[PDB]
Write a protein that binds this ligand. Structure first.
Ligand SMILES: Nc1ncnc2c1ncn2[C@H]1C[C@H](O)[C@@H](COP(=O)(O)OP(=O)(O)OP(=O)(O)O)O1
Ligand SMILES: [Mg+2]
Ligand SMILES: [Mg+2]
Lengths: 345, 538
DNA sequence: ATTCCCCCCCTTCGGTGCTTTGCACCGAAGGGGGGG
């Protein structure tokens, strides 16, 4: 369990820290100062060359700021249909019991982060973890391997279905779509805090011929075109490849997403619409869409997709942290090219 | 003497070794200077005499420091630096004088001999060896090994800063009211305590620093305003940049113009509406940093304008957390923008400018939403909070852009000031085909090898033109048949291209671009009333 | 003729990726300014 190492060939994260707000910096300071006295993190110096970005989020409970570390390179560099119950399989979070298992001493130097300061009045204050953090891909494995002794007391005489997840939120699988809001969370209450043109457009849409489904003609469709007229299922996901997610903005706060493994072979397709509300806050809808697709890839497949967001880089980097309310931070590129061909999807 | 601070454990990248670089010849002046600085630093215990270790030697040199007649001894450690482990730098940026509140009690204090006061790891002092040369010619030359932090190593900056922090920390727990800005070893101490009472804590901070062997000389102890801090002349209620002297010359070499652009970029954070684009375009092409560039006409009046802004004195003000942050952006033409952050009219916190061209073809709406993202992050850096904007664009002009753009784009809480010139989109493309319009099927293609391409169009009433062109491309020719569909049609025209490149360049409403072809298309998309476009792959 | 870190701007040049083997975008590196 404890003995963990890095995928052979690379060194460790060296990501810089983006600026933050006082409402976030103060929360991070009050969280780090409190954690230091519990022996969860420890101050370090510049002699550690590693760095991962940090920030804080207000979870939906809206009672306290939770800390978040952009532990993405530390997962990309680390080596090592059961939920058909109901539909939107749902659960809370499991990240506060993670502190009961210490990090390996040889490993702690990689999980280093920096706390910035307003107006840059003081050089950044660096810390490194001492217990298993939240957001590292191995941490659920090291924790589960020894703590599965508690993944049975909640069962007792309860078959239920499957469960599991990826980062920290151990999702459940209760088929019961009733109950007192699933009041059966008694052992889950334990061992968590106490360790333990019409023709033109239509032929355009027929360019989606052999691309998606091989074997089409699209010739009698263009019989009334190309001249001089007045313009007046069965998907295959190999569990070694990465699911890819594509998002397109279609106006009026309507977004379309398609999860595909290979190009033009989509395993999932959907449309997320929020109409007005966020209204001008489009970045809040996209960010919500991202927390909508991702968990879906978790419930049915298991791994987060790589998102080709239709947003600009700077806008996303500036505003994505404010609306984020998820422990995972998926990976994403940015589509700098009109995915608006000719009224498709 | 040398601070009793613990040392930072430093190793070398696994496998590399110390620098055996020779000691390049030095002028007798700098020889005397070096021997004097080195003799005193020897007695203090800063540099220890070296014997028969390995033959590690890094060269030495010496420059005149600040405006003083003192010399700074430095060491070319490029070779050690390349083989020394990597360090995460802690300074995440420089402090700006407009994120500081007005304070009745403020002192500027500087640690003297800052680097040569922190210890250096004993198991690394060897590699820092040096050979002060001989005053005569070949006299052996005393050689020493640095015991303190060297002024030229890569880890020295980070080690001093992280250490100065652990020295100021116990003093910060005792004084929550005090406000300390520590940039390296420069200290800005401010509180709203009584002047007589304040001084008494500036006599106690000094003793706390001295307990860790950090002398604070009372010659560089600024006690009364106007303080000189971070290049700024901070008076008690107003702050300004120290005097900026723009070079005045007849011939303008490339380096002189680079210096002018740098000074005007530094002078644009307080002075309003500084432009450098007409001068920054004299640096595109020529790479000879000595070619005598002749000053044009489009840059001479611009330089004169920049000089007239720098005639009268301007000043900023201090941050007032109670009030509100406002940012007023003004378009200045040719892709240039200005902005002013303030809390009351005619009293600016800091001015600025935006003149970056991020892309090939872009309009003013995108160029404004980029400037908004710049001021937004600069404010999150300086004040930690997003200001409220006063953009000169109509609410519906931005609403139509937000709902007819495939990308997600935002501007935070903003408001519209009716001052010319308002940002606007110069043309629009219809949703559905226009009834009773001449239809133009345009197609242009070339031969990669021969470089000449033919481009033409076919219409619904006989008209059919085809034109050849040379030095073309299978995309640049296609974007020319459209230009032939705009140069013959009336005020209403329907265009049916066949290229995904042609549409994307056209469907983003550009108003200016480098391509003379795209600009010529834009010019004729403006004089046209209702243009329409579509793509069909036949 | 000599150095080191940090922030910024402006220009140049080489990956990169989709494609339309060319064009557009992006990061890194020269130069300049400022600070210590
Ligand atoms: N030109 C430089 N080259 C390299 N390092 C420098 C340079 N200027 C300053 N530093 C570094 C090392 C210095 O100890 C530290 C602060 O500089 P500074 O305070 O001006 O010098 P100092 O404290 O050594 O001399 P003084 O006695 O005049 O204060 O930053
Ligand atoms: Mg000093
Ligand atoms: Mg100084």
């Amino acid at each position: 369990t404890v003995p963990v190492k890095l995928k052979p060939g690379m060194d460790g994260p060296k990501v810089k820290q983006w600026p933050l707000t006082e409402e976030k910096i103060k929360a991070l300071v009050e969280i780090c100062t409190e954690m230091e006295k519990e022996g969860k993190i420890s101050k370090i110096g510049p002699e550690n060359p590693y760095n991962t970005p940090v920030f804080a989020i207000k979870k939906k409970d809206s009672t306290k700021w939770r800390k978040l570390v952009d532990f993405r390179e530390l997962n990309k560099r680390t080596q090592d249909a059961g939920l058909k119950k109901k539909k939107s399989v749902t659960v809370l979070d499991v990240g506060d019991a993670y502190f009961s298992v210490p990090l390996d001493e040889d490993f702690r130097k990689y999980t280093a982060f920096t706390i910035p300061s307003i107006n840059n009045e003081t050089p950044g204050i660096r810390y490194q973890y001492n217990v298993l953090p939240q957001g590292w891909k191995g941490s659920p494995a090291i924790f589960q391997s020894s703590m599965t002794k508690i993944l049975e007391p909640f069962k007792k005489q309860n078959p239920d279905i499957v469960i599991y997840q990826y980062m920290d939120d151990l999702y459940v699988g209760s088929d019961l779509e009733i109950g007192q809001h699933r009041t059966k969370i008694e052992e889950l209450r334990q061992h968590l805090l106490r360790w333990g043109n019409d023709i033109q457009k239509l032929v355009g849409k027929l360019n989606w011929a052999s691309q998606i489904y091989p074997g089409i003609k699209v010739r009698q469709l263009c019989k009334l075109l190309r001249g001089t007229k007045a313009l007046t299922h069965g998907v295959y996901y190999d569990p070694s490849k990465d699911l890819i997610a594509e998002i397109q903005k279609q106006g009026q706060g309507q977004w379309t997403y398609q999860i595909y493994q290979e190009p033009f072979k989509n395993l999932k397709t959907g449309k997320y619409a929020r109409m007005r509300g966020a209204h001008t806050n489009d970045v809040k809808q996209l960010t919500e869409a991202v927390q909508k697709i991702t968990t879906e890839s978790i419930v049915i497949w298991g791994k987060t997709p790589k998102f080709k967001l239709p947003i600009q880089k700077e806008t996303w980097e500036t505003w994505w942290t404010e609306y984020w309310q998820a422990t995972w931070i998926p990976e994403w590129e940015f589509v700098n090219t009109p995915p608006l061909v000719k009224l498709w999807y | 003497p040398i601070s009793p601070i613990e040392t930072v454990p430093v190793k070398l990248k696994p496998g590399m070794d110390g620098p055996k670089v020779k000691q390049w010849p030095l002028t007798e002046e700098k020889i005397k200077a070096l021997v004097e600085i080195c003799t005193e630093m020897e007695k203090e215990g800063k540099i220890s005499k070296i014997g028969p270790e390995n033959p590690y030697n890094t060269p030495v040199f010496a420059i005149k420091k600040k405006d003083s007649t003192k010399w700074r001894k430095l060491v070319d450690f490029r070779e050690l630096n390349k083989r020394t482990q990597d360090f995460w730098e802690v300074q995440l940026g420089i402090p700006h004088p407009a994120g500081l509140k007005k304070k009745k009690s403020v002192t500027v204090l500087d640690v003297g001999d800052a680097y040569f006061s922190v210890p250096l790891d004993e198991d690394f002092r060897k590699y820092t060896a040096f050979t002060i040369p001989s005053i005569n010619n070949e006299t052996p030359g005393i050689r020493y090994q640095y015991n303190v932090l060297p002024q030229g190593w890569k880890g020295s900056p980070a080690i001093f800063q992280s250490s100065m922090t652990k020295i100021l920390e116990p003093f910060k727990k005792q004084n929550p009211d005090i406000v300390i800005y520590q940039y390296m070893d420069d200290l800005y101490v401010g509180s709203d305590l009584e002047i007589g009472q304040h001084r008494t804590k500036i006599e106690e901070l000094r003793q706390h620093l001295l307990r860790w062997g950090l002398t604070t000389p009372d010659k560089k102890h600024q006690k009364e305003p106007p303080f000189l801090w971070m290049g700024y002349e901070l008076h008690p209620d107003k702050w300004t940049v120290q005097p900026i002297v723009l070079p005045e010359k007849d011939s303008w070499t490339v380096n002189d113009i680079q210096k002018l652009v740098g000074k005007l970029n530094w002078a644009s954070q307080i002075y309003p509406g500084i432009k450098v684009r007409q001068l920054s375009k004299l640096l595109r092409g020529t790479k000879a940093l000595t070619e005598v560039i002749p000053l044009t006409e489009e840059a001479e009046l611009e330089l004169a304008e920049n000089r007239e802004i720098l005639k009268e004195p301007v000043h900023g003000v201090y941050y007032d957390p109670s009030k509100d942050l406002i940012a007023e952006i003004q378009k200045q033409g040719q892709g240039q923008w200005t902005y002013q952050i303030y809390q009351e009219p005619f009293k600016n916190l800091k001015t600025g400018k935006y003149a970056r061209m991020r892309g090939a073809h872009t309009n003013d709406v995108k160029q404004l939403t980029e400037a908004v993202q710049k001021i937004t992050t600069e404010s999150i850096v300086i004040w930690g909070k997003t200001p409220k904007f006063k953009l000169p664009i109509q609410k519906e002009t931005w609403e139509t852009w937000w709902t007819e753009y495939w990308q997600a784009t935002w501007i935070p809480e903003w408001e519209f000031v009716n001052t010319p010139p308002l940002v606007k989109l110069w043309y629009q493309l219809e949703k559905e085909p226009i009834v009773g319009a001449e239809t133009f099927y345009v197609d242009g293609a070339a031969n990669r090898e021969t470089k000449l391409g033919k481009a033409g169009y076919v219409t619904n009433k006989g008209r059919q033109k085809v034109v050849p062109l040379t030095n073309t491309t299978n995309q640049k020719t296609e974007l020319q048949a459209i230009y032939l569909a705009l140069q013959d049609s009336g005020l209403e025209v329907n265009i049916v291209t066949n290229s995904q490149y042609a549409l994307g360049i056209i469907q983003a409403q550009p108003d200016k671009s480098e391509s003379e072809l795209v600009n010529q298309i834009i010019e004729q998309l403006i004089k046209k009333e209702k243009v329409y476009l579509a793509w069909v792959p036949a």
